[PDB]
Design a protein around this ligand. Structure first.
Ligand code: GLN
Length: 239
């Protein structure tokens, strides 16, 4: 309420260490730097939120579906993995305040001339990461456009499959493809993005409320100081 208040609400941890599950490579959200350490928007936001408030977090970069299962089972306390907030997922998870606006998009090989619309995917192969918003879109529209869906395990696997010609196109989150394009990966995006959803930090529904509160209060603080915008701008420098 007090907009001139320069402090923070005190959120008290209840565990010596909270385990945070994540995807294994999903740049710019979580990915390895030159030293092999994981960095990225998700990693920086969660680690800084914890630092701001005396929480200790331990990241496990295990894959998207693995992270979902770990939080559901109680083996991880929370997850961050560029995870879209949806109503269906709210049945299993409590989500933070949204921290990023996203959506999905097709990518094809740089130099591809054939594919300019979804209808051009007729008789083609589209790679996608199992368990994701992209997979849901492709299944919904498979009858309509008449492509075949190939299920892969990671975003790196999508890029590999596309590049060596195992698939004709892939579908993944648009800022992820965009980061790849910005570092000259051989990707093109001839079909407009499907905007939709924001990302959230997630805990199991009804569990670990203070961990969720810690993220929310940290995000508020980082938004107030501009640290949030500096973190994003560390990875996304597209003007
Ligand atoms: N890490 C991912 O692949 C997440 C993809 C998408 N945002 C989802 O929540 O399904």
């Amino acid at each position: 309420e007090n907009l001139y208040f320069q402090g923070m609400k005190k959120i008290t941890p209840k565990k010596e260490k909270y385990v945070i599950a994540s995807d294994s490579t999903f740049a710019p959200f979580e990915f390895q730097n030159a030293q092999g350490d994981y960095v990225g928007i998700d990693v920086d936001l969660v680690k800084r939120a914890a630092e701001l408030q005396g929480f200790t977090v331990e990241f496990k970069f295990i894959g998207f579906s693995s992270a979902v299962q770990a939080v559901e089972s109680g083996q991880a306390d929370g997850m961050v993995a560029g995870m879209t907030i949806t109503d269906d997922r709210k049945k299993a998870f409590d989500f933070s305040v949204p921290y990023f606006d996203s959506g999905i998009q097709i990518a094809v090989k740089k130099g591809n001339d054939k594919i300019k619309s979804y209808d051009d995917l007729k008789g083609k192969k589209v790679g996608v990461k199992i368990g994701t918003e992209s997979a849901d879109f492709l299944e919904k529209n498979k009858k309509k456009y008449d492509y075949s869906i190939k299920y892969l395990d990671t975003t790196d696997a999508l890029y590999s499959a596309l590049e060596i010609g195992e698939v004709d196109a892939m579908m993944d989150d648009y800022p992820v493809i965009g980061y790849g394009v910005a570092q000259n990966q051989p990707l093109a995006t001839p079909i407009p993005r499907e905007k939709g959803g924001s990302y959230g930090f997630a805990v199991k529904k009804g569990q670990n409320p203070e961990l969720l509160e810690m993220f929310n209060e940290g995000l508020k603080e980082m938004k107030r100081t501009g640290e949030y915008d500096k973190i994003i701008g560390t990875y996304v420098k597209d003007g």
